[PDB]
Paper text:
To understand the role of Fdx in clamp movement without the complication of DNA binding in the [name] active site cleft, we determined cryo-EM structures of Mtb [name]/σA-holo without DNA, with Fdx and without Fdx. Although the particles in the original cryo-EM datasets of Mtb [name]/σA-holo were prone to oligomerization, we used 2D classification to isolate single particles and determined reconstructions of Mtb [name]/σA-holo without DNA and with Fdx (overall 6.5 Å resolution from 21, 000 particles) and without Fdx (overall 5.2 Å resolution from 88,000 particles). The cryo-EM density maps were of sufficient detail to visualize the bound antibiotic in the Fdx complex and to determine the domain organization (including the clamp conformation) by rigid-body refinement. Because this complex is not interacting with any other ligands that might be expected to alter the clamp conformation (such as Fdx or DNA), we will refer to this as the 'relaxed' clamp conformation. The two Fdx-bound complexes, with or without us-fork DNA, show further opening of the clamp (14° and 15°, respectively; orange and red in Figure 5B). In the end, the best-resolved 3D class, containing 21,115 particles, was 3D auto-refined and post-processed in RELION. The overall resolution of this class was 8.1 Å (before post-processing) and 6.5 Å (after post-processing). We thus conclude that Fdx acts like a doorstop, binding and stabilizing the open-clamp conformation.
Residue numbers in the entry:
A (entry chain D): 1227 to 1282
B (entry chain A): 1 to 226
C (entry chain B): 1 to 237
D (entry chain D): 443 to 1012, 1024 to 1030
E (entry chain C): 30 to 56
F (entry chain E): 27 to 109
G (entry chain C): 450 to 1138
Write the structure that this text describes.
Amino acid sequence: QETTRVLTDAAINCRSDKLNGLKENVIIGKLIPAGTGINRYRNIAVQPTEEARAAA
Amino acid sequence: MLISQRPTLSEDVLTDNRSQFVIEPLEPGFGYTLGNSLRRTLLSSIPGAAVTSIRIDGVLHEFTTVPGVKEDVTEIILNLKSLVVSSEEDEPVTMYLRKQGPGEVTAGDIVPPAGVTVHNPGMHIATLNDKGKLEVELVVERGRGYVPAVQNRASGAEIGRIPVDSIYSPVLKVTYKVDATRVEQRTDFDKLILDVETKNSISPRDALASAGKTLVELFGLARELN
Amino acid sequence: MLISQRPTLSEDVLTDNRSQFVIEPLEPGFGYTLGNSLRRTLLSSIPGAAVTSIRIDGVLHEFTTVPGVKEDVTEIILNLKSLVVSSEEDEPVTMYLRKQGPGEVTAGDIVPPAGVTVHNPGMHIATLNDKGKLEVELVVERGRGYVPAVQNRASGAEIGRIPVDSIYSPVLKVTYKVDATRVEQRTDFDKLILDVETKNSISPRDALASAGKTLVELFGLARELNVEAEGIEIGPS
Amino acid sequence: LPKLMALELFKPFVMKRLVDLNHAQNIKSAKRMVERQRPQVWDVLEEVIAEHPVLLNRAPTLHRLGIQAFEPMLVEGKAIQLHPLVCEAFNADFDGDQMAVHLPLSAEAQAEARILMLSSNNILSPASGRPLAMPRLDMVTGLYYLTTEVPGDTGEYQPASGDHPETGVYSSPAEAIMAADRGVLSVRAKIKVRLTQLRPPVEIEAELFGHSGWQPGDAWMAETTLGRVMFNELLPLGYPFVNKQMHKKVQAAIINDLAERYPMIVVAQTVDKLKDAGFYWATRSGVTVSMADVLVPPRKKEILDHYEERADKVEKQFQRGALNHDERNEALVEIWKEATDEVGQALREHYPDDNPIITIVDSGATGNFTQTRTLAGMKGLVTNPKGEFIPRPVKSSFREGLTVLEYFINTHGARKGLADTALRTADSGYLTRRLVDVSQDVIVREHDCQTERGIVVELAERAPDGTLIRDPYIETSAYARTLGTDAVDEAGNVIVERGQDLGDPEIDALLAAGITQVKVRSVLTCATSTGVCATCYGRSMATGKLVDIGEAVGIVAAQSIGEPGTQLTMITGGLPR
Amino acid sequence: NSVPGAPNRVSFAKLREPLEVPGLLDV
Amino acid sequence: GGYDTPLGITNPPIDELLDRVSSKYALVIYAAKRARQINDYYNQLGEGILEYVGPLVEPGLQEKPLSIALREIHADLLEHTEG
Amino acid sequence: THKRRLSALGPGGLSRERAGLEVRDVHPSHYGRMCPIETPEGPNIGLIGSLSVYARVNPFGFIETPYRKVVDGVVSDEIVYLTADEEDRHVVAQANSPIDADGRFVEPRVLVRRKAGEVEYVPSSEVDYMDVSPRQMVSVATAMIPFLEHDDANRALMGANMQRQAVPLVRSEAPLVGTGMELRAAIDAGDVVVAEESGVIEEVSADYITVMHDNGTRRTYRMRKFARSNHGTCANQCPIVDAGDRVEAGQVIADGPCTDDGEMALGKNLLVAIMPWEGHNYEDAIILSNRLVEEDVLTSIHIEEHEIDARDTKLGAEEITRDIPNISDEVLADLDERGIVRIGAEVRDGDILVGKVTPKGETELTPEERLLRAIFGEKAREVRDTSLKVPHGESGKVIGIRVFSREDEDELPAGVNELVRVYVAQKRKISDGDKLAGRHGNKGVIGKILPVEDMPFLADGTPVDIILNTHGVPRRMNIGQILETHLGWCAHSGWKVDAAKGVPDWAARLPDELLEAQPNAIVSTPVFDGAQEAELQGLLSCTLPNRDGDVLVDADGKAMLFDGRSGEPFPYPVTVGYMYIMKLHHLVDDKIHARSTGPYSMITQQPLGGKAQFGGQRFGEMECWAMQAYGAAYTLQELLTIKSDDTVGRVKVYEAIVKGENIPEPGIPESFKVLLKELQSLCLNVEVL
Ligand SMILES: [Zn+2]
């Protein structure tokens, strides 16, 4: 509703925003923070166990 | 101990296309089984011959009728369905009828050529006025049991033609049961009591034969085959 | 008339007297028609030398257990019951084994004389106590299919040979069923399932052979009646 | 798998495939042939059919469950080909309905699926955690039937020695199986036997072995009805043994129990297998229906009567302008109520045990003793289509049949609730919905808020002479619970210790701790600043296990929460209140 | 009754209506 | 573990699988990353190829890369850890 | 139904967004006014209806119930159209009520609605008026199935509305049983060619028939066929008799549609029975024969009109030739001289249609092409190659030809000079799974098709029509289904009261006359009137045992067929019977859809759903929430992007796809991008970092 002022205040506030409320993600669209999609996770550090690779 | 004595194959004279069946001794335990089974069979490719699709004069799609009639191209069609002309050999066998004057679409009327025998060759089917003329161009067939009306497109039979189903299964209806003797002191077995009827194109045998055949047939495999 | 296809044995080896199979291609729908029955059939078609409403010794009212021996007939009996009695003299045959001094008792502890054998003789049976001895009254006999411990015909006339059981059917169980398959092509044609349980004595496969035989033999009749039949075909080999 | 379905759809796949068997040119080539619609299609069509998940739903929505992904296999018709439980669970009944479904895509996703709504994966009451899709009704009922004994039977164990043996005792199974098969008995009907593999429950083995009741061998005696035996046979091998008949629940409870003890998998394997056996019996058993079945409340009337004069007379009494129209009007009503019960009971009472009907419900199958009476005898009361009841009421019954009136009164609220239905359905979620958001995001921080402010607990309502008494609702709580601190024994020690889920066993020996509180790393005391910590939360029942790094129970519960509203009525009652 | 092409779907009239079927439709 | 036998799909049992590692998430993903890789390999395969090895264990028909991965996965051949 | 249908809403009328249930509310009065039961159904019941039965309505919008205006144990054999009111003043007598053959209801006391419709008892001696029959605030449709008094109104009205949704397949049948409503109802079809004169017959043939209006006088009264419904159905209108016979005005002449032997053909008096079976009549599940096929029992055909205009505009207009660009041959080797083929012609999907065509444009191409065309001399034309082609689930034979020209004067909308509209047959040969049913609301999907054999079946062989799970009715109510069906086999099978020596007591009464049933024959009963149980029951006892004077049937309801498969006996006796039903204007093609892709809102390029389109189902938000309950992210996200309207990946990965490769990983909410812009827009600038 209104928001409007809810607009103002902002630049007033000049704030940024936690950017977390999934809805956010929803908002943006940029995928959620969790579920299938997480930092730690989605930044995994993966690859084969050598030996096998060594095994060529 | 162990005991045997091959049972007692024996049909049971009855109506037309129809005389029961009885046999034993019978492994104290089973009857039904093959009882049905067979019965379950039967129904089995009751192989037969008969039409397929046909046609006549200006007989386009099925969605008018001929004058003189009181009738419907279709149910006509149906009625036809009632067919009952056991033929003979193999091929897209056919036939052709015509009419004139007061028309009376019954059975018994057309050109049953070679190896072609109706069974109620008269079976009314419809009728037309004194204008009750017409022809019919009619494509028999052999086969067995049902099949869906082909696509004459996928097929090719001319425009007026009308693919149809078949049902080559001259049987009528089955029924029977056991009677397992089995006397309660150890010394027992089953008792056979049977019957069906067909669509008056054969005797119980005939098929019945086919039965025993494809059966035994059915089992060479089943045998020690390996 | 011919298949335009052709089901086919599928051997499956599981155990000794248990192991599955199937056979296919399988136009719908007959496993029911067949197997099933066959389940019967075979099930039904299974000759074997089954025992006899037997007995042993002075107990015609010690109607439970015995000295020098801890077990009890019932126990004994299923233990009794338990047997790979392979034999031949299609008929009776009392048979007698004993042993004083304790120890215990397995199968072959006795003698299967003529046309009669064991397949388990280690088949323990009797754990002796106070060193007891005791021969035992035992007959067996063949046939297809087990026969129940019918109220034996002595109606008392017997010395105690108890209206026991006896399986003329050396088989041991069955399993199976139907499988609709290949549809676009073989417009969903049946698919088989063929396990079933025997005695050690033989493979399914075996009398199975006979089964299909046997089995057909019947049909011969129906079949053999007017060869003028259109009995649909497989093709040869 | 209505084939011509994504048959139609899938396409673009092979669309890149196809000419891979260079049989089209471009794709318009194929494609355009997709217009051609060519036997070849059905083929590698097959390939692409390669284990590919599926998108699925019928709305509405109640919660995450009501959807999953799967693998089918093409078939004709045009509707859809399913499972039971998948039903119910996913509710929608073959009243004439449908669903919604789409293309699993990014193996990213599809993956996701097999991970997730993977048919399997999908289990119990993740909200209320406890079990879910158990067999049921028919399935069950057939259960009951089998499960349910049949004393006074053929072959029925014969403790008739003294003149020869007794019989009913049987080493192997197929044994009398094979037999009785041999028309000789209806398993339902105890006798005697033995085992070696179908382990006994402990007790048995408890002494037979104590050391090891393993039945990978060691024969163990036996004796009952098979059937029940049958089932058994079908069960957690590693499990000892059961016996008896059981109820839907029961069973279920177990069941739950069962997998609880173990991994996914299997579970169904059985499950299915089970229903199957039923199914069989289902078909088996045999219980069509009869008007004949219309068992008859005897004197019944005379009771009626009774009430009639009761009121009646009373009618005269008020009639004297005695009191208010109502009150008396009630007492009247009461009178009825009285009847209500009486009729139902003694009615019921009368009929013999076996009437599948009731037996059904009786089988815990469903239904109610209302349906019971209601059905026949009387149908009881009715209320103002606007409120208060109906000064009649429902003397006769359907089965009996009645005039207009009556039914012509059914009519009203008939319309109404009906309507309600049409509403609670509506406002329900929305209500929720607001529920839906309200919070969200509110999820996991971590494992260990690291607070120290869980609360001791009630732990049953203890007791005087009874020493100890259990809140039922204990259970409602009591579990997925954190050793907020260290379960000490009766002073004697600290029976257990801060930080644990406090599972049944806990519940059980600790149960034997005759005590009634334990501080517990709940959560509302979540030290985790934002979000939450495992320690705080910890295990999902939905998991039956610990939670994860960041989790949306807010959903969940939110579902869990709203959804169930689902079905309530009614200083206010349902929701609004 | 009063039916030219009438057959009889024999019914269970325990009763009587001197009245008979209006024409509705009229309306 | 004498339970039974999976079926492509049911192949294999996460129950196991799961055991390998904690959160289903990456884990799966993880696999994602792989197959992705796999594909790539195949994606690239025919050409002045990249080093890209695998799919280690031999193939299995159309087998979704997906699987494959799944295989050497429970086959247990690579490593990882979040980010 | 549509007729008599009645409400009070809409133009100037109510707006359901404003009306208290009361609007829908019950109330006394109501009787003899409109079907208590039926109504709308969605948020809709209590909103609309019709009349009850008889009572005409005021020269001023108010019912006109006449009544058994009684007089001194001697009702005044007299209508009294009544506006409830008035009346209201008066005394509520009771139809179903035992008079001393004189008005003299033989009891001293009775009941009766009062001031508040106070359905109040009372001493017979006092009313002014009784009634006009039983059963009246009823509806026709209401008026349709007995056993009511045993059956769910809910379930009822359900079936009520249901009732309609039959589908005049083909065969023509009537429930051997059924009240009198029926054609005497059906007659109020007032449709069937039906007599006009006591004239002797005259020349006859399926178009009409000459009619010896015995005044010499005649008139080849007509008869229609093959002409669509609002719903794609023939004009069929089947005859009756013989060009020579002799009959009389108002009597029948020829059915046609819902018109079994002069009568709404409406279902199939059909065996089947009671089991819930192998889980296939479970959860609404439904287990179904097959012979049926073969039998055919289940089909008619259905009618689209098929249209496609010739237009006029900028670059030219919309020609309809038969020439075409690089069209296949046959594809053309088929239509008429200059487009579409010829009546009664078979097809399939895709199938091109029109002979259309239109100017294409004028905006160059790559030399590349042309060149190319020069490369292959395929000197392209330049006209918007345009026409029509058959979509999906579509075939049959040519029909319509409403090819109507503007140009040919055939007035038509702008920029067009003509248009045809055409039709094609298709005999719908009934899929299982689907749904049908009959009376007792007792709806029923159509689960599985099932070959004959393989089928429980008479000990006398003959198997089912299908079978029936159990369970519902209990928590449902409608068992007449049971009874009625008992009945069914009965009638179907006939009998005779062996009353002989004396009287089947319960007999001792009733339409005596029956005494028997010539195994199978016409059978009605009253609504709130019909025999009883015991009787009925005892009727059970009665019989017309078969051929082998047999009755596999039990004086009990449960016999014992065996298995058309495994075959053996059963556990216990077999409940069974018969039931006419009806068939459904609601199945797959009614709703058989999805959508791979197609059009997309030239604005919100979403799946431009449409005819050509499958719509492409919309998606819900909960749902999303479900995701959440997992978090497949992507997935959803994806969606949002993908099938949502990801212009790119759509294109892009669409490619990928095309190139089948570790897909263009999910990008960015793009558009969203816009935003920003959108913001800025208002001095809004900001940012994350
Ligand atoms: Zn925490």
